[PDB]
Amino acid sequence: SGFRKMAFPSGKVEGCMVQVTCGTTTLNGLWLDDVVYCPRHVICTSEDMLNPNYEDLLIRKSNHNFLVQAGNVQLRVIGHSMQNCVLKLKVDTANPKTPKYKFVRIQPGQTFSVLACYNGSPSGVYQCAMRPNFTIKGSFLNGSCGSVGFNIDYDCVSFCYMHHMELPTGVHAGTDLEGNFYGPFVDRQTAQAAGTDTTITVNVLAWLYAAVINGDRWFLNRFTTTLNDFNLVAMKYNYEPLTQDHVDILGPLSAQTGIAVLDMCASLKELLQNGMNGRTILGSALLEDEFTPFDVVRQCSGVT
Amino acid sequence: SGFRKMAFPSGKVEGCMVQVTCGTTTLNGLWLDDVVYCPRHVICTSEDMLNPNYEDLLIRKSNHNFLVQAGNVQLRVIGHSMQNCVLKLKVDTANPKTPKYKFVRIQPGQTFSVLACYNGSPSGVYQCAMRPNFTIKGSFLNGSCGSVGFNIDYDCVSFCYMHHMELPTGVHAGTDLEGNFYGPFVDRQTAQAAGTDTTITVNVLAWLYAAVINGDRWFLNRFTTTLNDFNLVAMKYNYEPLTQDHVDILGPLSAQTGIAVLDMCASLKELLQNGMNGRTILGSALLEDEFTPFDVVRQCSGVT
Ligand SMILES: *CC(=O)N1CCC[C@@H](N(CC2CCCCC2)[C@H]2CC[C@H](O)CC2)C1
Numbered sequence A, B: 001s002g003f004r005k006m007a008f009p010s011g012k013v014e015g016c017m018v019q020v021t022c023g024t025t026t027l028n029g030l031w032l033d034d035v036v037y038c039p040r041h042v043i044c045t046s047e048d049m050l051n052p053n054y055e056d057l058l059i060r061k062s063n064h065n066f067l068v069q070a071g072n073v074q075l076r077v078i079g080h081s082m083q084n085c086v087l088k089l090k091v092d093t094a095n096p097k098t099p100k101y102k103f104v105r106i107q108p109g110q111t112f113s114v115l116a117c118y119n120g121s122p123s124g125v126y127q128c129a130m131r132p133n134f135t136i137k138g139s140f141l142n143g144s145c146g147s148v149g150f151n152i153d154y155d156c157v158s159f160c161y162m163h164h165m166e167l168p169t170g171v172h173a174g175t176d177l178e179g180n181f182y183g184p185f186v187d188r189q190t191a192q193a194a195g196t197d198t199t200i201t202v203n204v205l206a207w208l209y210a211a212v213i214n215g216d217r218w219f220l221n222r223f224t225t226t227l228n229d230f231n232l233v234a235m236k237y238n239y240e241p242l243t244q245d246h247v248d249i250l251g252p253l254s255a256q257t258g259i260a261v262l263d264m265c266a267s268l269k270e271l272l273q274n275g276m277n278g279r280t281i282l283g284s285a286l287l288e289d290e291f292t293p294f295d296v297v298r299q300c301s302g303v304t
């Protein structure tokens, strides 16, 4: 028993981290097979960071200008290209530590682990969620750009995120591994609006099921509700509307605990309307939304 | 910016996990050089788990009874011995993935990462603290025994914990890598009292400094206090007494922020006496104590 914000073991990803330098800018790259992936803003300078013309900036760069270092060994760059907001540097050596991998574009509300890196060196790993507004609340300092987010299914790493920037509000924005930003963000030093964020309702319900499984049951009540009544409350409290797809994904947890999804919705409704009254659930004094129903089943069953 | 409960990258530890089976019991082992370390309770059975005579039980076991598997390859056991509550199985092959390592006995209040494992396979990584009562609030299911806790200093892994058991209260107990339990716990299926736990005051103050660095400053007030006055409040709220050693370790954070340690103690005093009034600090609605002053500096400076 016990419930923790657990990240995937980062080993398969640590073996892929490299340092990329262009001019005087250094950030992280991801070395998979004979390609190194990194944020294209590695080619920009302070003079043009307000509105870089990446096409023109990349034209002034040659293969030998991209310095790629894997630990202490230098990689030879034999090709370079820009795909959306990522640079793909073809190298002459395939990474011997390349795990089985996929590039995936995650949905908002889904979770992933982040391996924060500096100078191509891993510093730490944490679990987070892609917010409904397509930002992530990470921990990233200068030099963390190019750090990636991922999920692991047995031996396969699905890379889903590459860090590009911190908004003036302290939240983080990035791309999938094809260089497409999550959300409306652009890779330029400008004030950018992150939309109204909402709480991931299906994840809070999944976490409430995790709480019941682990013995924290005080919030269970003698009430039920309907999807429509619940959604009136969800809208009032800036929670995502619950759909029948969300109810269906909660099926296994409803089955294991014997608590119907709409009965758990009534418990959640009461917690939203009345607060926690100074109590905690799984060591938290607020409603946690960064655990998916998949994460709860995985953690509560022991998926390695 | 941003503040997360970050674990160390687990790669160096993943390379050391093996599966150990004895009779019909399977748990995890840690393969370092030519030795595999695991909980000695791997040799016990349901009939004798209430009070095992480990000396007598180990005498009925031979080297060939200990099945050690590293992924898909079987290791040859050429020696076996019990040191306190751990079994040391000498193998004929040194682990080629053995990182630079040390065995350390951590102090209560110190933090470490845990690589939860099942059948010798890593499932996830999380950061936790050794409670003042020598328990850890982990996430461990059946088969997680032998999973280890560690810290990483550049290329050196300091192993500090090996998981042995879950108390009837759902908290976790284990040993250092010499097999000595943290706390008064014994490796037997009996009701065991975990003492009164207290909040790690120096860590809460370190986290308050992390909050200030990241912009969460609402809790700062126009007051100061003394070590003696503060400790009267700490005792009332089951917080560890703050010593001058704790004030000294907070020195760097006091210097960076310009907030004297006793002024931060007055902010903490007010938060204890008045609560959070429905507000949050670093995304938490309670006072976090599982970040040491070292963790706050590391995360806020980018130590890889
Ligand atoms: C995140 C990271 O590691 N890096 C590499 C170093 C430069 C850095 N920033 C520049 C770019 C410009 C284009 C849009 C994204 C950010 C700067 C911005 C100014 C700040 O004062 C320091 C980091 C990105």
Ligand SMILES: *CC(=O)N1CCC[C@@H](N(CC2CCCCC2)[C@H]2CC[C@H](O)CC2)C1
Pocket: B025, B026, B027, B028, B041, B044, B049, B141, B142, B143, B144, B145, B146, B164, B165, B187, B188, B189
């Ligand atoms: C934690 C773990 O992986 N393992 C291996 C499988 C047996 C397990 N437990 C037995 C020992 C007995 C000695 C004291 C520590 C626990 C059992 C206890 C009973 C429970 O119902 C299942 C796990 C330890």
